[PDB]
Structure 1
């Protein structure tokens, strides 16, 4: 296992604050809140089965999806829309991309360690998540 996804990473923040907002138009306060909100997260995979959750005040969210075994998730709590996903390891990565009105809500959570450059495409005008910690 040359990846060790299973990590912690007190989220720093996203770059295109506004483009990720659009990925699921919560509200205008949403993006400004998350902009500065340095939340916590921590994934953990065992092979073909992983899970992670965010730790914010504003909103609580989670992905909890397998690795390539397509699944119709939901964004309940946040916006309340229906979605689907798909994940495939891509080096030290695990290319996820949402569906169900999304079609461009994917990430490039490739792990470096102490630093991390999750790239939140999330619709046109790609955003760059900015992680750092574990």
Structure 2
């Protein structure tokens, strides 16, 4: 049984600016956003999952039930909202973000001490890897 609970620090973030360009994020904000190295704080509580992407620039909080479609407010990212469903696919977590953009979603999984996150839109792929960490810090 896969359990994503933990605190995770960004190690790599590959091709994020092109992913943001495919979302039509303005160039100045793409530059700002790709300098950020947010942590992830995840609590998996039965089928209720909370994924907190944490940085001093901004926190983005996902709070959902696996298998239940919900309205995801991404307006601070790319001025859009999606109808999002997160589901198990073997040992991976699959997210489909239905909306104006084609093929928008992500896939998350664990390898050893690494949290792997692949995000996609319009055929453009960004890959992030985080390392599991144990020193915790307070966030709001």
| TM-score normalised by structure 1 residue count | 0.83
What per-residue deviation string (whole Å, max 9, x for no partner) do you get for residues 80-104 of structure 1? 3221111111222110121111332
What's 1:80 paired with? 79
The structure-2 alpha-carbon separation of the partners of 1:12 and 1:122, relative to structure 1 and needing over 3 Å to count, comes to farther
What per-residue deviation string (whole Å, max 9, x for no partner) do you get for residues 11-50 of structure 1? 2342112232035333213332332322111111122211
Higher Rg of the two aligned structures: 2
Task: Tell me how far apart the structure 2 counterparts of residues 95 and 36 of structure 1 sit (CA, whole Å).
Answer: 26
Q: What does 1:1-134 correspond to in 2, within 5 Å? A: 2-134=1-133
Conservation of the 8 A alpha-carbon contact between 2:94 and 2:107: yes
Q: CA RMSD for the aligned pairs?
A: 2.0
Conservation of the 8 A alpha-carbon contact between 1:17 and 1:127: yes
Structure (1/2) with the larger strand percentage: 2
Unaligned residue ranges in structure 1 (runs of 5+): none
The structure-2 alpha-carbon separation of the partners of 1:52 and 1:36, relative to structure 1 and needing over 3 Å to count, comes to same
| TM-score normalised by structure 2 residue count | 0.80
Give the 3-state SS of the residue equivalent to 2:29 in structure 1: helix
Give the 3-state SS of the residue equivalent to 1:38 in structure 2: coil
